[PDB]
Amino acid sequence: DCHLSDMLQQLHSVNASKPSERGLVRQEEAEDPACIPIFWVSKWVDYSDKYGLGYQLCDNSVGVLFNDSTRLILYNDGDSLQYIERDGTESYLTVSSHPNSLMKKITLLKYFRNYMSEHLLKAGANITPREGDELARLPYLRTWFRTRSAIILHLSNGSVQINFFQDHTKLILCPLMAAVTYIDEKRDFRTYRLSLLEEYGCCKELASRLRYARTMVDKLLSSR
Template structure:
């Protein structure tokens, strides 16, 4: 795994045109499981509820947003001062093991090819393992059972590789209020985007850059770490969906990213957009629906809507 991973640093960026952001290729990924059990203590499992933030839910929210927003708007609503949890780094090693990723709260996970998943919390105190039936076990790193040791070592290696070789996907846009009441945006130096075996950006290390703040869904002692539920790769983009419903698309050519948080209403849902300069801004979906947005975001929302429709159909949802 080390030799294969080190070769990733020498790969070049994909330079695939968006072609109007039409989704020419049919998404066929069904690589996901619905969590059927949760845990409320280290090592113990209890029955839990299924997640109800589905692809169909987000499709309906996004479709309503696009239908409602006014035409010909060249600006965006006032950004929020926080961002939803999203994927800041990823590595595609599915030719052998699976898909590794880091979230904006610094938790890390691997989605293995056998549909099992392992994650470690941002404070490195909890290891979570989902088997391929959706059952969840939580242990501390110091008490790992023997059967989990190999996967944990792979998780640590993936985390170390991403930490040493990949930089964060985007910077937060800090929103401050001036004395006149107008909002002004400031951001730190932007960092390069994450990469994979075929390249989604450059592999520069980023030191001292501020990470995007998580408004919800982050891991803590009382919450499980959101994990990658499914992912797809097309010539234009990589598409990822977290277990909390959050839906993310990273575009290869210009390194822009669009993230819709996994919520059940447009008042709750947030839209995070990371532009080609790696500067991010977060908006309430309801504000985008009422005020509109610039053409770049709108195009990517149309693309996201097409992807969500296909995912919803794969899941047997009517949209």
């Protein structure tokens, strides 16, 4: 949509400025704490051979994008559910009210939540998300895919997250803030305004990852 189209242009503008080819790179000047994300994917499990893709958002809400194209999200209170059917029908309910048709999906989500809780590390554990609007909605996973080098996650708030498998580095791109958060190999988390990276530049690691990110957003837009 337009979130992705906006993000492609923001990336293209940075990359076209050749930011790792500044005489003096002042990456630190492109930092903006006001732009840190409200939400990102802190854990995920690909069980798409059988069920779907389960994930945890940094607020400890969990969701699943099931093989049948439905989506179920358990809020961080551990009771409140949001269910999205194939036709887009959206329902708000509780695990504790007793919806018979959803009990198998509920127990599947509880399985993912419990797996991720026992076994997986929380990405960005050290980071406080920025403050989000009082009446804003919790995002869900719109789309995802993997390449041989990363998993790409597209959230319904327009964010795109990219986890690089080999060195554990991660980007979180928000087209609304026009910002990227980079989590480096030593788990340092930095958030930059893309237009400032155009002004001040950045290192060859971040530059290289932003060029890859643009290729991923093109894949997103190609699937449509």
